Amino acid sequence: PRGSHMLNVGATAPDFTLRDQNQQLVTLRGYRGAKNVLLVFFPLAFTGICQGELDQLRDHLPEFENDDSAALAISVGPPPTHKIWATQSGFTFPLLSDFWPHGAVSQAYGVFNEQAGIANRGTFVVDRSGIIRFAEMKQPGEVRDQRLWTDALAALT
């Protein structure tokens, strides 16, 4: 529980179990020993810079979801909201609901905007040991770079 003091590289990634857009439970620990995990926090479905960011993820998804890697997008929306958006947008990767308690996982990663009640645009790569290996927060206005995500992942083996 850290508001917006982003966790740093070398920290243990906080565990979570959240519902995806099809109401399945996704748990970060379940990847430990098996894949590196890209976590893409985003503020609000249907609006903002994050439509373009998630569209880049989509447009390069086989590079992020494979035998070595998984990608999970996280926001405060509940599953029905993420289902509709994912269907319209062509998103087939998990969108997870940090919905109730509201923003709890975003807060644990230090990427929550307490004033607005939404996640900031933070991104992490978690290795097979559960350790944060890459961390960023983008300041209002600048869009994240999906090429940098793939490069971070490629370095992890």
Author numbering: -4 to 152
Quoted from the paper:
We assessed the performance of these methods in the identification of sulfur hydrogen bonds within the active site of the enzyme Alkyl hydroperoxide reductase E (AhpE) from Mycobacterium tuberculosis. To test our approach on structural coordinated atoms in space, we used the active site environment of the peroxidatic sulfur of peroxiredoxin AhpE, a single cysteine enzyme. AhpE reduces H2O2 to water but no H2O2 is present in the active site of the AhpE structures. Method 3, however, only finds the interaction with the water molecule, not the Arg116. It is predicted that stabilization of the Cys45 thiolate by Arg116 will promote its nucleophilic character, so that this Cys represents a catalytically active state of the enzyme.
